[PDB]
Amino acid sequence: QVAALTICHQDLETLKSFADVEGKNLASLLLHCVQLTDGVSQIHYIKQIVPLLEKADKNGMCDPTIQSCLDILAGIYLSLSLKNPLKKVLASSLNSLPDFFLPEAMHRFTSRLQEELNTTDLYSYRKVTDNISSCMENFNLGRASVNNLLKNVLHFLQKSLIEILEENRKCAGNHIIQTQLMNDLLVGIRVSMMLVQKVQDFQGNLWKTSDSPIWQNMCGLLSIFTKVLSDDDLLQTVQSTSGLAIILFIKTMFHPSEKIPHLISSVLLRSVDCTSVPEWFMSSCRSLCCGDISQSAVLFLCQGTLAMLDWQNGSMGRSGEALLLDTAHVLFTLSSQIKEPTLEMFLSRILASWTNSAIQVLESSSPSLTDSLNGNSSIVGRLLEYVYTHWEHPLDALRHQTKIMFKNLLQMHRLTVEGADFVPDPFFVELTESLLRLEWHIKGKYTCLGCLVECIGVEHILAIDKTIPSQILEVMGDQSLVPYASDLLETMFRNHKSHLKSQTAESSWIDQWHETWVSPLLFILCEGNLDQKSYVIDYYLPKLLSYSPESLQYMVKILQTSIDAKTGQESCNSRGALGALMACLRIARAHGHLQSATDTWENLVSDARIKQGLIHQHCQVRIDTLGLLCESNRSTEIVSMEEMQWIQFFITYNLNSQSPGVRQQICSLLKKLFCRIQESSQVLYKLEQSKTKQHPSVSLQQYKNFMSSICNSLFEALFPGSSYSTRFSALTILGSIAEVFHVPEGRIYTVYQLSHDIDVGRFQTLMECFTSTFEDVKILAFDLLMKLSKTAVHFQDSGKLQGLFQAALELSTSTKPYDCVTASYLLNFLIWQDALPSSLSAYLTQDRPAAVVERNTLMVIKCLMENLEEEVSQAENSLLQAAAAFPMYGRVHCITGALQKLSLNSLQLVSEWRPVVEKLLLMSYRLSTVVSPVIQSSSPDVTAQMVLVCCWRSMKEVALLLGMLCQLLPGLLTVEQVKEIGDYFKQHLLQSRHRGAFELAYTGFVKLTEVLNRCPNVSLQKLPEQWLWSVLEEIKCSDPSSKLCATRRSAGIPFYIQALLASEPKKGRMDLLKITMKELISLAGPTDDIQSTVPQVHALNILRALFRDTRLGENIIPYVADGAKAAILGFTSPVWAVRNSSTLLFSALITRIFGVKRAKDEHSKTNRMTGREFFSRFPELYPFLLKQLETVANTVDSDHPSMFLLLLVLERLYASPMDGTSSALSMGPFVPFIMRCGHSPVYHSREMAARALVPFVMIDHIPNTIRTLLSTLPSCTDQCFRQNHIHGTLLQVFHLLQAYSDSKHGTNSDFQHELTDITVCTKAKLWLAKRQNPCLVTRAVYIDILFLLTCCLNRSAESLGFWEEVRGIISGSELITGFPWAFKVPGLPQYLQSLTRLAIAAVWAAAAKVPISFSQLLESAFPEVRSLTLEALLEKFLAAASGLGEKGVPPLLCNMGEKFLLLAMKENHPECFCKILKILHCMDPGEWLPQTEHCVHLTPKEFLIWTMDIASNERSEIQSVALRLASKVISHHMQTCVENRELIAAELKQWVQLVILSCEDHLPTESRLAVVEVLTSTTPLFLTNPHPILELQDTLALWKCVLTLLQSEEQAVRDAATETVTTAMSQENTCQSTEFAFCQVDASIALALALAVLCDLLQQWDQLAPGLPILLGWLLGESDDLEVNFWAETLIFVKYLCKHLFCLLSKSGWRPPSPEMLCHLQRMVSEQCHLLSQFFRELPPAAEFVKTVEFTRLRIQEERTLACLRLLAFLEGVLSVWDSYAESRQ
Amino acid sequence: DVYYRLAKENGWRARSAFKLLQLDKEFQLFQGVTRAVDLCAAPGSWSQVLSQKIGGQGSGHVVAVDLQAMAPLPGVVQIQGDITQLSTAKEIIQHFKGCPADLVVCDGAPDVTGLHDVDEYMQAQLLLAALNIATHVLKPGGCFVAKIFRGRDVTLLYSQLQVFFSSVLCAKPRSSRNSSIEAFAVCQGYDPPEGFIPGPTRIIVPFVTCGDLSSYDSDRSYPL
Ligand SMILES: Nc1ncnc2c1ncn2[C@@H]1O[C@H](CSCC[C@H](N)C(=O)O)[C@@H](O)[C@H]1O
Ligand SMILES: [Mg+2]
Ligand SMILES: [Zn+2]
């Protein structure tokens, strides 16, 4: 879009006085140009302007016609805004004027500019400044003009700036006007800087005399700049630009140039002597001298110093270097004082600029500066401290600037040590080693290592540790670390390739490169876990393939081999090879690399491989194969026939994907495919009309057929009862088709049009998608219907549309809470296609389609309003029937939904829209008054629950409607109405007293408040601040008798405050926040008054919300510390409420400070920050915390303390591993107090102190700390024993030892000596574990320490003495003796567990080379001793038997079958019984089943009966374990002898019934997992047996279990069932039923494959005759015969079963012999058809919308019965019932 | 989940009702209970379950108490007040002179913040108050069910609870969110200390109020 050129009216005659009818002169061209509208031919004539002037280079004196022509050109140019490209157009044109005409144009354009400069309108100043700006850039016409008018332009700039400042200070209160004025100031300052920089007049002195007008204007400008810099109520951009300008002018205006660096230096140091500066400087820059300038002023001045001075070439010399160092010093001083967020961002930018300037200076500097700027200097140390403190700042700009600073620091050091011999500098090596000590979750580690890699080369980092690539790849399974790891790895291998192609110049280097970077990648791709695979494919693999595409050939050859060897074995590496190959090929094709070969290759992909990938079990493989087919580098490449067939195959099965991400990726790739079809069809058409390949008309026909069949599939996927994912996918892909093929409607040819394929019935189904319970489906259907052409009344007659309108009106008043959504969508559809009935024209009094949709909206809204008014009146009469018959919220919802679609800002019938809005507000208030008393209070054939539903839904709808109406930009909304709306929101949301109307009103109020901010009326935009003040002074004198409630976290007051604070412009000014936080922090402070509790309570309730709101975000940081103090000081208050509020606020503060949790469980170090970062961000907490800690420590000895919160904070701070300098704030002082906190008489405090002490101790100091901590324990003969002190000391040493063990485990070899010292110290005080110690808690902790020591000693190989001491501990324990007194002594179970762990450790130690034996541990009377022993035995057996690992049971557990067999019958503790059964399952039945006869007096058969009885009765994990055991026993019986099949028959039937039982619900997921595992293990025996052992009913029952679990709602069961299906299809007699043998497949196709295998077996067993009745009974669904499921569709099973039955009967021609067997089926099916006709008859009109659930279930049953009729009719060729039902229905 | 629906579909005031029922069929809480106390029932779903399973006989007496107000039920007496306050404890115990309650349930929880240590602290306070009420009311061998927050360290709570009860079990029903760390301690067989009144008490009561071991401390070397 362009703006039409305009001209001055009185110029017309002026240009008419020189025009000519013939049109020879330029004047006629001007006439032709000005009288136009298109801004395109004007441009052409503008070019031809130049030749017209060129063709008159003979006169020698400018023609007056040409004079007036150029004058009018100048006037037009100066009247053109900068948004118009024509302005630059004629600028460029006049740039090429002939040299003869220059002087007159100069003079006259000068005159025009001069008279422009004399304007005095304040708001016209911006245009003049923009004109001056334009005359500078590449416009030779204006450059000379302004060069001739320096005095005038400078005077204009000065006066304009002064006047704008005055107006801004006068227009206080309105912030839009102020914003415009600030922008004008900014453009003025920038233009002034441009002028000074870019005018060839300021060079030389030539004007520095005091009398020069230029000099005086410059001094005035400098004074204005200083005044605006020192100001603080302006935008910070203005002040920063002012500082730049100040430095530029000082540099320009100062005659003794060599003294400029010194003078500026003093100005920065605030040490300027007022008696030595020149007089003009003192006059203009009085603020700069004589002190007292803000910190922002100094910040911006040093910014300007760095930016606007010549640092290169050493022009400023030694004084320049001194200025550089002084600026660094000033910046570092400011860094510690600045706390405003925006000022911190500015300081980061300025520090990065300082590094740039240091680079430039250092390139030619003096040797003295080298010493002061090298990497070991103090300045660089401070810079590194800044970087380490700030790389993880919340603000993104901060972090980016820190990255720049770090890179520049390394460059500075390189420049300083250019006298280098060998590449690896000691500084770089030390930095690298220090960085490599950080954890891999530290995000700054990656960027810093990348910079270092580019500095010193990756070969040295690899030499330090050559497993780094693998370590980086192992974190790639965690998203939000993937980008950093990917970038680091990319930097690494780019550098490595550049290094290998160095001196060693051959071709073999690539091999090494491959084995460094590709082989680990292949291993991850084939065998990594799922998340790791997805993230590596999405983020890392494209980078590697793009950088080195010739590596693709290497990868494929490796993967293809691993594929083929798979067929040799009929391994995981051979199993993941297909997915990796598909990922590599998809990436290669999408980037156009060597794989761009016309159906994806000649031989890389085969039909079998592609079909296997497209249907694979892993979502990633399916997506990668689909992407290989769908997306290509060339956007118009032909889609081959093979790709079309594969895509149809894919669509058949992949419409029910459950992951929303997977579904979205599928839809996007399909859209890409449709775009390719559309774009290549145009190429085909072009070739066709252009009268190897296949005659493009053939390909066009193929495209048409393909698109038609795809649409057929998509519309088939909309069957009744279809899942949410399948409707979502179908509607998404249909909408994508409608959008993609809607392109060439302005064109001539289109290969496909969706509208042609839309029948009446397909339109009916699309509208019926409005009844889905999910709003996403409603939205997608609405969008698709709107995208179609000729749809409104083409597909619908008037009567049926009237029925639809009646249906929507009826849904708007239904008691079901979500029918109103359907009614709203239906009504919007009728409105936006002009399908409303004609009677609705009777509501209003009387092409622009906006006008007709507005009229329709008005009519429907008026109808709804009439109904609503009547219903509200009757509700006022009596609310019972209103809740029962006509709840009023449906109409309100429909009205709001109708309004939501309009553009409220651009209505056109305001005369009609005003009274309707008035009535709407009145009825909203009436309804709210009716239903609110029921919602604050309790209740006043209609239950109270539905009354409450009506009431709160009405509340919500009214709030949303008011929030909608607030967007009319108050006009249709008067100021009184807005005030009343705000009052309504305030009356609620502060008096609700209930959860309702807290979050209900908040959304509407937020909408109103944002609108109120953006409003230009001044009287309205002052409302939020006034409301904030009102509520604050309400808070102070709360008077607990008020309506405000303390429960529900507060009386909605936090929501009110949040909404008011939301009005503040984003990052704009945030002045309400400062006031609110000052007042709330003051209120929450300690109060002498007892009555002052409630104001202190609400504050902590409000503050909490303010500290977690996302909008306040980084603006709330400067208050955190204060808030923290409050919380902590509020934890010691005697009142309970203050402490509870303090706890909640402290939780919010912890989340705000340390961030959201990064992983579910471990929280190793993911939410901790170093002491340096924490105490740099909140430096006022270091004294406070320390002081507070000391206090509580001194309370411990001399006795609700706040020890808990202090320790909880302190536990999340650790010491920085790469602490280049010693800890400046030195967390060390905390250690003595933390230790003393361990002597608290509260268990939790002792535990917390033990946990918090760990981060504050260096690892190398842990041994000495442990020794000195142990030395404080009392010896056995001492006389002072304090149990709390001993327990705390023991907890501390236990946690310290645990931390010590988890490091220095294999890294060191010297810790053996330290461990020897530790164990000597522990042996010195072993007495606390024996029976002399009376309390069991202390014994337990000491025994835990001993056990940890045993674990350490075992893996680290004196020890003999330790072991005999441990044996002495165990032998004398109550584990052998027993507990004498029958009193529940504290700590007993914990003590028993500790003893048991130590005893088991002793037993293993003795065996591997005895105080107690496994045999007599298992006989102890304490269930927990038995449980621990059984757990140890179970893990041994599992690791030795199930997960063999080339191992066997240890020799000590060889003959335990009898023992466990006896225990199983003896045990009564369920938790141990389950473990006993698991152990029995783990052993070979051939070794313990024979012994069953005499050990427990049971034959194997009756033992099996016993196990099945257990499995039938229990309903916990023991059920699944018992089922597994019974199945194992049965399998053994069958596999040993052939005589068992006849003596286990009844047991086999009972087992089948048990499996069926365990398949059902009310059982844990483990039961169904166990069923699937059992069936998988016994497929070749009970499922695909060539000669079945069970009866046919039992075999089919097992198959039915498999099929019903394969449709389970939960993913693990489905995956396991697919594994069962793979086993079933992979058997010897079933390898031909399908083509996916030995393939793992998704559940969707697994259902079909299982049915295929079952039918093939039924034929193979030759037992089809009694089989068909059962399968047809499955088809009928005997369950009904008359919570939503996100995966299972009934009709999918019906369709697959019917299709395979047809295929079986066709290939067999089975022809049932006896009709009597099927006669029963015909009887029941005919009865069902009769009932279905009866039910469909008595169903009200438009039942698809009024009776959706009944209609849907009837339709599903009808589809079942029709499928069964189709099969029966095929078999009998009773089609009479078929015909009668077809006539009754159709 | 599914129980949020089933709470609205059925006559249950909240989903939490299904947590109580699923704890019967696995522990047989309602064996012979006649009078029961309900602590911290926000809408009253647990009170409703108890009334329908005990008060269905007719003589069942149920006392419910909460910090907020509740809609009254037939056969249940409601009390509004902080069970931490001594006055509320006294007025609760006022209902049980003579015949003691056979069952005491506590569903309370603080405003769960998300980080689990503070939740354990606050829940420990609430459980101490609930345990005080229990020991002051229910008959020996009785039942005490209490919501707990299973975090990293739960040994102390189990140790303290084991002292007063024969059996203590930790259960997570199906209705409890799998992401949530809540659980239920079911305490079977109220077995109060012999010398305990609402010797042994000097060691138990300090340890139950807090992990106070300042009863085994001595001013002379321990006897052998
Ligand atoms: N100190 C205290 N005194 C009394 N009730 C408390 C309390 N702290 C928390 N609560 C109560 O604990 C409950 C948290 S959820 C309660 C759920 C309820 N039992 C049900 O059947 O669904 C709320 O009722 C809250 O009021
Ligand atoms: Mg509500
Ligand atoms: Zn002075």
Which residue's entry shows tokens 């997921």? Answer: A1565
Which residues on B lie below 8 Å from A939 (Cβ)? 71
Classified as helix, coil or strand, B145 is: strand
- The angle subtended at Cα A1427 by Cα A1423 and Cα A1433, nearest 5°, is 145
- Selection from A938, A983, A984, A977 nearest residue A958 by Cα: A984
In this structure, the strands spanning B143-149 and B182-190 are: antiparallel
What's the CA gap between B141 and A1206, in Å, rounded?
41
Annotated binding site of B for S-adenosyl-L-methionine: 44, 46, 66, 82, 107
What's the CA gap between A1024 and A982, in Å, rounded?
10
What's the CA gap between A830 and A1712, in Å, rounded?
54
User: H-type helices in A417-467, by residue range?
Assistant: 426-435, 443-456, 458-464
For the beta carbon of residue A1318, count every other beta carbon within 10 angstroms: 23
Under 8 Å between Cβ of A1549 and A1594: yes
In whole angstroms, what separates CA A931 from the centre of its chain?
39
The gap between the terminal CA atoms of chain A, to the nearest Å, is 56
User: H-type helices in A101-149, by residue range?
Assistant: 102-117, 125-134, 140-147
Burial of A693 (0-12, 13-18, 19+ CB in 10 A): exposed
Q: Which of B68, B120, B163 sits opposite A1386 (nearest CB)?
A: B163
- The angle subtended at Cα A812 by Cα A807 and Cα A818, nearest 5°, is 105
What's the CA gap between B154 and B160, in Å, rounded?
10
Under 8 Å between Cβ of A1128 and A1202: yes
Pocket test for ligand 1, best of B6, B19, B66 (most atoms within 8 A of CB): B66
- Selection from A1661, A1616, A1657, A1653 nearest residue A1635 by Cα: A1653
Tokens of A405: 């600073």
The ligand placed nearest to the CA atom of residue A287 is 3
For the beta carbon of residue A1347, count every other beta carbon within 10 angstroms: 19
Which residues lie across from B171 on neighbouring strands? Answer: B184
- The angle subtended at Cα A47 by Cα A46 and Cα A49, nearest 5°, is 65
Under 8 Å between Cβ of A1256 and A1234: yes
Which residue's entry shows tokens 């820059």? Answer: A285
Cβ contact B121–A1337 (<8 Å) = no
For the beta carbon of residue A803, count every other beta carbon within 10 angstroms: 16
Is the minimum distance from the CB of B109 to ligand 1 under 6 angstroms?
yes
Maximum C-alpha span of chain B? 67
- Selection from A82, A122, A74, A123 nearest residue A101 by Cα: A74
What's the CA gap between A10 and A19, in Å, rounded?
15
Classified as helix, coil or strand, A1100 is: helix
Helix pair angle (A889-900, A910-936), 10° resolution:
140
CB neighbours of A776 closer than 8 A, spacing ≥ 6? A728
Pocket test for ligand 1, best of B12, B37, B40 (most atoms within 8 A of CB): B40
Under 8 Å between Cβ of A1294 and A1263: no
What's the CA gap between A1208 and A1204, in Å, rounded?
6
Whole-angstrom CA distances from A352 to A303, A403, A553 are 10, 9, 44
Under 8 Å between Cβ of A1237 and A1207: yes
Classified as helix, coil or strand, A663 is: helix
Burial A408-429 (b: 16+ CB within 10 A, else e): bbbbbbbbbbeeeeeeebebbe
What's the CA gap between A451 and A435, in Å, rounded?
12
| Number of residues that make up chain B | 224
Cα four-point dihedral sign A1132, A1135, A1136, A1139: negative
How many helices (H) and strands (E) in chain B? Answer: 7, 7
Radius of gyration of chain A (CA): 42
Q: Which of B5, B82, B213 sits opposite A1337 (nearest CB)?
A: B213
Which residue's entry shows tokens 């001298």? Answer: A289
What's the CA gap between A1561 and A1557, in Å, rounded?
9
Which residues on B lie below 8 Å from A1247 (Cβ)? 153, 156
What's the CA gap between A53 and A105, in Å, rounded?
12
The DSSP H or E segment spanning A949 is helix A944-965
What's the CA gap between A638 and A599, in Å, rounded?
10
Under 8 Å between Cβ of A391 and A399: yes
Which residue's entry shows tokens 């009274």? Answer: A915
Atom of ligand 1 nearest to the CA of B41: 19
| Number of residues that make up chain A | 1786
Burial A1676-1686 (b: 16+ CB within 10 A, else e): bbeeeeeeeee
- The angle subtended at Cα A926 by Cα A925 and Cα A932, nearest 5°, is 80
Whole-angstrom CA distances from A703 to A508, A641, A732, A752, A1340 are 48, 9, 20, 8, 77
Q: A434: left (phi > 0), else alpha (psi -120 to 50), else beta?
A: alpha
Residue nearest to ligand 1 atom 26, measured at CA? B67
Complete edge-to-edge strand list for the sheet that includes strand B182-190: B76-80, B61-66, B35-39, B103-106, B143-149, B182-190, B165-171
Whole-angstrom CA distances from A1113 to A159, A341, A1120, A1126, A1149 are 41, 11, 11, 20, 12
What's the CA gap between B26 and A611, in Å, rounded?
49
Indicate the residue type of A1066. Answer: K
Which residues lie across from A41 on neighbouring strands? Answer: none
Half-sphere exposure of A1221 (CA within 13 A, CB side): 18
What's the CA gap between A1426 and A1460, in Å, rounded?
12
User: H-type helices in A1015-1162, by residue range?
Assistant: 1018-1021, 1023-1036, 1053-1062, 1072-1084, 1093-1108, 1117-1129, 1136-1154
Whole-angstrom CA distances from B168 to A1262, A1340, B130, B143, B165 are 38, 20, 16, 10, 7
Under 8 Å between Cβ of B140 and A1173: no
Tokens of A1715: 């009709």
Cβ contact A939–B211 (<8 Å) = no
What's the CA gap between A860 and A840, in Å, rounded?
7
Cβ contact A1334–B122 (<8 Å) = no
Which residues lie across from B38 on neighbouring strands? Answer: B64, B105
Radius of gyration of chain B (CA): 18
Classified as helix, coil or strand, B148 is: strand
Which DSSP string corresponds to A579-593? HHHHHHHHHHHHTT-
Tokens of A351: 């520090």
What's the CA gap between A853 and A1621, in Å, rounded?
56
Which residue's entry shows tokens 């020591």? Answer: A1349
Q: A634: left (phi > 0), else alpha (psi -120 to 50), else beta?
A: beta
Which residues lie across from A1712 on neighbouring strands? Answer: none
Which residue's entry shows tokens 């002034």? Answer: A192
The DSSP H or E segment spanning A1324 is none
Tokens of A1592: 């046919």
DSSP state of A769: G
> In units of Å, what resolution does this entry have?
2.7
Q: Which of A1136, A1150, A1334 sits opposite B84 (nearest CB)?
A: A1136
- Selection from A53, A47, A135, A138 nearest residue A102 by Cα: A53
What's the CA gap between A1301 and A1740, in Å, rounded?
76
Atom of ligand 1 nearest to the CA of B15: 22
For the beta carbon of residue A142, count every other beta carbon within 10 angstroms: 24
Return the residue in A939, A1144, A1162, A1243 with the most chain B beta carbons within 10 A, the one to mutate for interface testing: A1243
CB neighbours of A1485 closer than 8 A, spacing ≥ 6? A1528, A1529, A1532
Spell out where chain A is interrupted, by the residue before each break (C to N > 2.5 A): 570, 691, 846, 940, 970, 1199, 1357, 1409, 1682, 1773
Which residues on A lie below 8 Å from B212 (Cβ)? 1241-1243, 1284
Q: Which of A939, A1242, A1334 sits opposite B216 (nearest CB)?
A: A1334
Indicate the Cα dihedral angle A297, A301, A302, A303, nearest 10°.
Answer: 100
Is-catalytic flag, B147? yes
What's the CA gap between A1512 and A1553, in Å, rounded?
10
Whole-angstrom CA distances from A1123 to A1106, A1141, A1201, A1577 are 10, 12, 19, 62
Sheet strands (E) in A563-693: none
Under 8 Å between Cβ of A920 and A965: yes
What's the CA gap between A842 and A820, in Å, rounded?
24
Whole-angstrom CA distances from A152 to A158, A205, A658, A798 are 10, 20, 72, 75
For the beta carbon of residue A561, count every other beta carbon within 10 angstroms: 12
Under 8 Å between Cβ of A1461 and A1469: no
Q: How far is the CA of A995 from the centre of ligand 2 (A)?
A: 6
What's the CA gap between A620 and A607, in Å, rounded?
19
Under 8 Å between Cβ of A618 and A656: no
The gap between the terminal CA atoms of chain B, to the nearest Å, is 59
Burial A881-904 (b: 16+ CB within 10 A, else e): ebbbebbbbbbbbbbbbbbeebeb
Return the residue in A995, A1335, A1384 with the most chain B beta carbons within 10 A, the one to mutate for interface testing: A1384
Half-sphere exposure of A1270 (CA within 13 A, CB side): 25
Burial of A747 (0-12, 13-18, 19+ CB in 10 A): exposed
Half-sphere exposure of A149 (CA within 13 A, CB side): 25
What's the CA gap between B208 and B131, in Å, rounded?
9
In whole angstroms, what separates CA A1382 from the centre of its chain?
57
Locate the chain A residue with the closest alpha carbon to B71. Answer: A938
Burial of A1382 (0-12, 13-18, 19+ CB in 10 A): exposed
Output the 3-class SS for B149-207: ECCCCCHHHHHHHHHHEEEEEEECCCCCCCCCCEEEEEEEEECCCCCCCCCCHHHHHHH
Cα four-point dihedral sign A257, A262, A267, A273: negative
What's the CA gap between A1423 and A1389, in Å, rounded?
10
Return the residue in A1139, A1147, A1393, A1517 with the most chain B beta carbons within 10 A, the one to mutate for interface testing: A1147
- The angle subtended at Cα B130 by Cα B127 and Cα B135, nearest 5°, is 120
What's the CA gap between A1548 and A1559, in Å, rounded?
17
Under 8 Å between Cβ of A1550 and A1512: no
Which residues on B lie below 8 Å from A1612 (Cβ)? none
Cβ contact B217–A1283 (<8 Å) = yes
Tokens of B166: 């024969």
Cβ contact B222–A1332 (<8 Å) = yes
What's the CA gap between A1507 and A1519, in Å, rounded?
10
- The phi and psi torsions of A696 (rounded to 5 degrees) equal -40, -25
Which DSSP string corresponds to B20-38? HHHHHHHH-TTSS--EEEE
Whole-angstrom CA distances from A130 to A111, A116, A144, A440, B120 are 18, 12, 17, 52, 65
Tokens of B96: 């049980």
What's the CA gap between A440 and B57, in Å, rounded?
64
- Distance from the Cα of A1180 to chain B's closest Cα (Å) equals 24
Classified as helix, coil or strand, B97 is: coil
- Selection from A630, A424, A655, A665 nearest residue A534 by Cα: A665
What's the CA gap between A550 and A548, in Å, rounded?
5
